[PDB]
Amino acid sequence: VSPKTRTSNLKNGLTIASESNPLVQTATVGVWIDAGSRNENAYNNGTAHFFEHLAFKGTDKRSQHQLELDIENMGGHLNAYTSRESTVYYAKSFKDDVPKSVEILADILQHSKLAESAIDREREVITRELEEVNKQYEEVVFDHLHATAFMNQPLGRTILGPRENIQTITNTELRKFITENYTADRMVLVGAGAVDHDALVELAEKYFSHLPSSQSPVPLGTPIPNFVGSEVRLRDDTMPVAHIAIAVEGVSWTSEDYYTALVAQAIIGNYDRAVGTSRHQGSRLSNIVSENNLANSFQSFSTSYSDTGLWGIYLTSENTTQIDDLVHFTLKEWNRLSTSVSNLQVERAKSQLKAGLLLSLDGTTYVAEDIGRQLTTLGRRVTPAEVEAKLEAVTEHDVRAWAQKTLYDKDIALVGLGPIEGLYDYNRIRNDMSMMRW
Amino acid sequence: ASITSVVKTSELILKSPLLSKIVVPLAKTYVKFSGYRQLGFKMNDLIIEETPNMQLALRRLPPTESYDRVYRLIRATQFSLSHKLATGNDITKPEEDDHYLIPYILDVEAEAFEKDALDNLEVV
Amino acid sequence: ATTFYNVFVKRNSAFVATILASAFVFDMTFETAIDNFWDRINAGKQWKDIRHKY
Amino acid sequence: YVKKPSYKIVPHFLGFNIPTVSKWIPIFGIWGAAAGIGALFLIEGVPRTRQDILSKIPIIGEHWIREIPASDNPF
Amino acid sequence: GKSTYKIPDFTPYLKKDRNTDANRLFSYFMIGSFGMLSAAGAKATVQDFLSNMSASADVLAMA
Amino acid sequence: MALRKKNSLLNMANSYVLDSPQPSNLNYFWNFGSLLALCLVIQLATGITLAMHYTSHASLAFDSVEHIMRDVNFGWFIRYAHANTASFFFICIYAHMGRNIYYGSYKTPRVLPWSIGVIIFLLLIITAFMGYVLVFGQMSLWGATVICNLVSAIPWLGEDIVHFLWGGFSVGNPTLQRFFALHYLMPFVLAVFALLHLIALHTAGSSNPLGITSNVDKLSMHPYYSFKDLITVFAFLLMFTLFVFFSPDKLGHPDNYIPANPMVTPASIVPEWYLLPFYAILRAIPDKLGGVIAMVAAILILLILPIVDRSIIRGNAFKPISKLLFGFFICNFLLLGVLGQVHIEPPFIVLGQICTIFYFSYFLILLPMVSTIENIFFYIGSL
Ligand code: HEM
Ligand code: HEM
Ligand SMILES: CCCCCC[C@H]1C(=O)O[C@H](C)[C@H](NC(=O)c2cccc(NC=O)c2O)C(=O)O[C@@H](C)[C@@H]1OC(=O)CC(C)C
Ligand SMILES: CCCCCCCCCCCCO[C@@H]1O[C@H](CO)[C@@H](O[C@H]2O[C@H](CO)[C@@H](O)[C@H](O)[C@H]2O)[C@H](O)[C@H]1O
Ligand SMILES: CCCCCCCCCCCCO[C@@H]1O[C@H](CO)[C@@H](O[C@H]2O[C@H](CO)[C@@H](O)[C@H](O)[C@H]2O)[C@H](O)[C@H]1O
């Protein structure tokens, strides 16, 4: 039984949430923001990502060089990432270096220079990032998957944004973005590891007290996405490995089917030929794939957003003449979530998840990420007891009912990259989303 | 029938004193009249091989055993087409009729059968 | 629409059963409808129309 | 402390078990109906089908009770 | 033109209610009607055609 | 690359008749397949020629066959060849099936060619049954009457089905004309299924008399098996010659030289010899429907050999007890054939029932028991 997550508020509406661990000597503190690329329009798409670069380019007090020195002197590091709905800025340090790190974070968020000289310098760095993500095949596949599934909608935009916007982002629009979105009621200061809650709340009162509140304070994790069945093919015969993602519209964070979708995802599970245990996994798809050498790997996912999600699978394969078999058998395993799953598969997957959801949290950064994600998507940290109860309530009837409305005979979003000549047209893939025998 | 079944049933018989006393002499006569040794075969050379399990067990044979089995099949095929029997050293002596393949196929089948059982496990 | 889909369409067994039952009903009703229409456009001409005289 | 995982093997044959098959029982039912309706529809023209089955159905059954007038029948 | 993340324009073709049961049901109504007429047409065809094998009028006349 | 391999059409022929890799140790019982191809070619050639001179109308049918015998140049030969080759077709098919059962040709991985083979055998029976009716002699008519009345046993619809098959209320002209059309067709269907069973076989290749793999030692189909097949082609032609030229009516029934007469019933109505065992099985069951089911089951039960044979070894070459059982099974099948043409009299009635029980118990009891025990004997005996 893990220590309780303590939670306090400030007057502006900033949440402070902490989980102490007197067994470790380091602490991760940071700011989880309920804002990301989704909050941009088509004209300033890329702003959120751009700001993340400029946040470390110098403040009203410390210059870029001074900033570097300050963090180096603390001894730990700083890290940041921007997604579609969430921005994070955190600092891993020693126990007694926590007040320094909170001070640095408050400074880069509230009092960043955004000087025209630095904007112009980063404009080239970010331009180069456009031509180097091309190598990260999984990211390419998932960015195209969002682009097609949420065609011409805010969730369909990339985080980097288009080349055109990168050349036209001004300090004005940067300042406007962070003034509108980085408000206290959308921010959570999170501490995990060697932190005292009462100390963290004092530091928050010292550094984050002059944060603007938004005009209309909605609860944390408050959002209409219209999924498009569609495909993107990025054929490249020179690549040896095909990368394929297939997804349907999934579930949001607060869906009533949230846990049912996770259990269904665990029944299919993951596979990797490089891991020794993977040939012995219980998953039917895993057995088909390993026995027939159909793939190098597959990973089931159930990605959630505030008002929608994507549920599906990501496959990698060198077997270019049996891509048809791989996709065929994958979708036939999905069909069985509607037609055949019983207490056998469901209880097994629940057993695996009950542990998995706790296992994931194995260091201070993981714990801080968990607190921050849950507070910014649900508005609370869900205790392991509540999670154990919600998982226990998932029955085989629930999985079958969920699959029959979410998977069975539904439109998919499909992305293929690489030697995908063997991937059949949309209709033949989508026809595998039902069984004529049932 | 699975090799596993045959081996286990045989072991039940060999345990029972009465049963072994009556079955072992019959089995030895059977093998003499079977006459596979007169084509230079070992008993295991006759087992049906066109199954996934058997193809796996044959791939696991040590290379030497595998090369010798190939030769015995080719040699028996040549006796068969000529309507001749082995003579001299080509005849398999009872002491040479070793179960070289049985351990490999029993391991293949043990895994296959455990996989089937475990595919049907119910969390209690 | 959900209800209808779920009952008659979702399972192919049910979809095929519904198509075959519909084919049966169509076949019987179409027969009767054509028979009546054919008799009206060819009224007074058929044996059934003059039979009563004989 | 838990020493061993807690599970049993359910009876199975040719890779079928009772939990799975039981999910498909209603589907066999509907297929059986489909095959029944289909078969009956195929022999609806057979006079015995009409005499023995179809004409006995209440209300609907009079669809299949049709007499040729003796004046119009050479046989 | 260059970015492959900017999906080409599909607005001339996209239905707004594409994810609804009503949308799917309509297309299955067309498929179903077609299956229905094909079943009724097959039955008519088979029955009329195979009846050639039943006693012909001249055989029934001599009965 | 050689043209025979490069050109897709030539390559298909090449794959079956020339480069086809065969075991090097096939014995003469592997010659029946090409003899069956020869019977089929003779039946097509003679049958299409008879169709040019035969008239299917009941008023002319029997006389058209006499016209063939008497007036058509070599008509006697073409008719006798067709009639005798029908018998040879069944001798070859029983030999071929006997080889397949003895050598375990039905075992995995050859279940599919064996199962298509069972359908070929059923199609041969129907083909020959309809062809025999076409003569429209006494046995033609009365055999059609009794065999088609077996369908009356089908519950509820049986009588209706019979009238539908006949095209009337007894076997007559409508029946004869439809049997002609179907007799012409069925051999083409049979040729397709024969080809299908060879395509299915081509995945595993021929089995061989030792029951082991031949992947270690293959021979091209040509010239080795081409020239081996010629020997039995000429042996067959010698047998054919002795029947067709010297004893053309030995295998036939004299009553089929009397024109069909619905009034007079022949002394004994028996099927052609090759159907006799199935007829004895039918007689054994007192119930009409029972008898029909048993008779059909006697053929369909061949489909379960892949299941009831529990042996870990393919075929009987090395199995003394299986060989003895097979010998009893074969001789019982011949005795059933003889009992199919005796009168329904003591003591042949009870004998036919015992032989029928033995026929079915081979599949259902004896082969599963014997094959189980031999597995144990091989293992213990060689320890
Ligand atoms: C598997 C192939 C065939 C078999 C087993 C077969 C068998 C028979 C038999 C047993 C008869 C009775 C023969 C008699 O006693 O007179 C017959 C007659 C006949 N068959 Fe076939 N037949 C075959 C193929 C064909 C084909 C392809 C034709 C093409 C039309 C055909 C045309 C005839 C005709 C016209 C007769 C009647 C004349 C007669 O009796 O000889 N047959 N057939
Ligand atoms: C028109 C009738 C048929 C023809 C022309 C035919 C032809 C052939 C040929 C050419 C072969 C390969 C050579 C050989 O083994 O003899 C073969 C093999 C085979 N046939 Fe047939 N066949 C016929 C009927 C049947 C029937 C009725 C069955 C089974 C009930 C059957 C089952 C098989 C099997 C299992 C094989 C593989 C045997 C082996 O090599 O071990 N066939 N057939
Ligand atoms: C011209 C290309 C057409 C391809 C098929 C033609 C025929 C064909 O494949 O021939 C081969 C010569 C085959 N014999 C064998 O496999 C064979 C194999 C092993 C040993 C022996 N003999 C041993 O001592 C063999 O004889 C054979 O007789 O089968 C006929 C039935 C086929 O006819 C058809 O299915 C089509 C139709 C005419 C029935
Ligand atoms: C696997 C398929 C199952 C078996 C197939 C069944 C084969 C034969 C079935 C019925 C054939 C005769 O069935 C009979 O057919 C004819 C049409 O064909 C119908 O006759 C009907 O239509 C015809 C013209 O279409 C009119 O001339 C007639 O006045 C009218 O009654 C009879 O109402 C029906 O009783
Ligand atoms: C009278 C019959 C009418 C004409 C039919 C001709 C014979 C039947 C052929 C149809 C079967 C073709 O089906 C397929 O063909 C190819 C092309 O040769 C063959 O392929 C086979 O031979 C080729 C080379 O000879 C090999 O590379 C291959 O590994 C092997 O499978 C096989 O036979 C079968 O896999």
From A108, A105, A87, A270, select the one nearest A187 (Cα to Cα): A87
> Beta partners for A88?
A32, A81
Phi-psi region of F179 (alpha: psi -120 to 50; beta: other; left: phi over 0): alpha
Strands annotated E in chain F: 21-23, 218-220
Cα–Cα distance, D75 to A198 (Å, whole number): 108
From A217, A216, A242, A247, select the one nearest A231 (Cα to Cα): A247
Contact D15 B119 (CB under 8 A): yes
Q: What is the DSSP string of F17-47?
A: HTS-EEETT--GGGGHHHHHHHHHHHHHHHH
User: Judging by beta carbons within 10 Å of its beta carbon (0-12, 13-18, 19+), is residue C41 exposed, middle or buried?
Assistant: exposed
Q: What is the DSSP string of F305-329?
A: HHHH---SB-SSTT-HHHHHHHHHH
Cβ atoms of residues F183 and F134 within 8 Å:
yes
Q: Which residues contact A232 (CB under 8 A, 6 or more apart)?
A: A144, A145, A147, A148, A414, A415, A416, E4, E7
Cβ atoms of residues A292 and A325 within 8 Å:
yes
Q: Which residues of D touch F156 (CB under 8 A)?
A: 48, 52
Please give the radius of gyration of chain D, using alpha carbons only, rounded to the nearest integer.
26
- Phi and psi (nearest 5°) for F208? -145, 165
Sequence letter at residue F84: N
Interior/surface letters A260-285, b for 16+ CB within 10 angstroms, e for the rest: bbbbbbbbbbbbbeeeeebeebbbbb
F197 is in an annotated binding site: yes
- Among residues F5, F6, F57, F202, the one annotated as catalytic is F202
Cβ atoms of residues A394 and A354 within 8 Å:
no
Angle CA(A374)–CA(A376)–CA(A377) in degrees, nearest 5?
65
Q: Is F159 designated active site?
A: no
Helix ranges (DSSP H) in A18-115: 47-54, 64-74, 98-110
F222 is in an annotated binding site: no
Cα–Cα distance, F376 to B13 (Å, whole number): 9
Structural tokens at position A319 = 């077997």
Cα–Cα distance, F38 to F44 (Å, whole number): 10
> Beta partners for B70?
none
Interior/surface letters F35-49, b for 16+ CB within 10 angstroms, e for the rest: bbbbbbebbeebbeb
Cβ atoms of residues F121 and F86 within 8 Å:
no
Q: How far is B123 from chain D (nearest CA, A)?
A: 4
What DSSP character marks residue A80? E
The three-class DSSP label of residue A59 is strand
From A73, A75, A76, A66, select the one nearest A108 (Cα to Cα): A66
Cβ atoms of residues F269 and F140 within 8 Å:
no
| Alpha carbon A395 to its chain's center | 27
From F64, F90, F91, F92, select the one nearest F78 (Cα to Cα): F64
Please give the radius of gyration of chain B, using alpha carbons only, rounded to the nearest integer.
18
Cα–Cα distance, A170 to A189 (Å, whole number): 28
CA of F134 relative to ligand 1 center, distance in Å = 8
Sequence letter at residue A171: N
| Dihedral (CA of F335, F340, F346, F351) sign | positive
The three-class DSSP label of residue A187 is strand
- Give chains near A: 3+ CB pairs under 8 A: B, C, D, E
User: Judging by beta carbons within 10 Å of its beta carbon (0-12, 13-18, 19+), is residue A55 exposed, middle or buried?
Assistant: buried
What DSSP character marks residue A381? P
Q: What is the DSSP string of B63-107?
A: HHHHHHHHHHHHHHHHHHHHT----GGGSPPGGG---SSHHHHHH
- Phi and psi (nearest 5°) for A13? 115, 10
Cα atoms in the Cβ-side hemisphere of radius 13 Å centred on F156: 9
Structural tokens at position A347 = 């209880």
Q: Is A124 designated active site?
A: no
- Touch between chain B and chain C (3+ CB pairs, < 8 Å)? no
- Among residues F272, F311, F319, F374, the one annotated as catalytic is F272
Q: Where are the domains of chain D?
A: 1-75
F53 is in an annotated binding site: no
| Dihedral (CA of F27, F28, F34, F40) sign | negative
* Residue of A141, A148, A163, A228 for testing the chain E interface, max E β-carbons within 10 Å: A228
- Touch between chain D and chain B (3+ CB pairs, < 8 Å)? yes
Q: How far is C27 from chain A (nearest CA, A)?
A: 25
The three-class DSSP label of residue A301 is strand
Pairing of strands A297-304, A271-272: antiparallel
What DSSP character marks residue A239? -
- Among residues A19, A40, A52, A231, the one annotated as catalytic is A52
Cα–Cα distance, A161 to A42 (Å, whole number): 9
Query: Alpha carbon of A323 to those of A304, A407, A416, A418, F206: distances in Å?
Result: 28, 21, 11, 12, 33
| Dihedral (CA of A306, A311, A317, A320) sign | negative
Q: Which residues of D touch F157 (CB under 8 A)?
A: 43, 46, 48
**Residues framing ligand 1 (Cβ under 6 A):** F 40, 43-44, 47-48, 50-51, 54, 65, 79, 82-83, 86, 89, 127-128, 131-132, 134-135, 183-184, 187, 190
Q: Which residues contact F325 (CB under 8 A, 6 or more apart)?
A: F362, F366, F367, F370
Sequence letter at residue A258: Y
Structural tokens at position E27 = 């297309």
Q: Is F222 designated active site?
A: no
Cα–Cα distance, F259 to B116 (Å, whole number): 66
Q: Which fold has domain A6-208?
A: Cytochrome Bc1 Complex; Chain A, domain 1 (3.30.830)
User: Judging by beta carbons within 10 Å of its beta carbon (0-12, 13-18, 19+), is residue F180 exposed, middle or buried?
Assistant: buried
Cβ atoms of residues F153 and F286 within 8 Å:
no
Pairing of strands A15-20, A187-193: parallel
Cα–Cα distance, A353 to A307 (Å, whole number): 24
What approach was used to elucidate this structure? cryo-EM
> Beta partners for A78?
A91
Q: Which residues contact A36 (CB under 8 A, 6 or more apart)?
A: A48, A82, A83, A84, A85, A86, A87, A159
Structural tokens at position A345 = 């598969």
Interchain contact E46–C (C-beta under 8 A): no
Pocket test for ligand 4, best of E46, E48, E53 (most atoms within 8 A of CB): E48
Interior/surface letters A344-359, b for 16+ CB within 10 angstroms, e for the rest: bbbbbbbbbbeeebee
The three-class DSSP label of residue A1 is coil
Cα–Cα distance, F134 to F61 (Å, whole number): 7
Interchain contact D74–E (C-beta under 8 A): yes
Contact A147 E6 (CB under 8 A): yes
Contact D75 E46 (CB under 8 A): no
Lookup result for tokens 């095209």: F167
Cα atoms in the Cβ-side hemisphere of radius 13 Å centred on F186: 21
Cβ atoms of residues F16 and F199 within 8 Å:
no
Smallest CA–CA distance from A348 into chain B, residue: B123
Q: Where are the domains of chain F?
A: 1-383
Q: Which residues of B touch A347 (CB under 8 A)?
A: 122-123
Cα–Cα distance, F139 to F272 (Å, whole number): 9
Cβ atoms of residues F357 and F280 within 8 Å:
no
Cα–Cα distance, A37 to A52 (Å, whole number): 11
Interchain contact F160–D (C-beta under 8 A): yes
Helix ranges (DSSP H) in F202-304: 226-241, 276-284, 288-300
Lookup result for tokens 């030539």: F10
Query: Alpha carbon of F164 to those of A76, D48, D64, E51: distances in Å?
Result: 94, 13, 21, 9
From F314, F303, F308, F311, select the one nearest F373 (Cα to Cα): F311
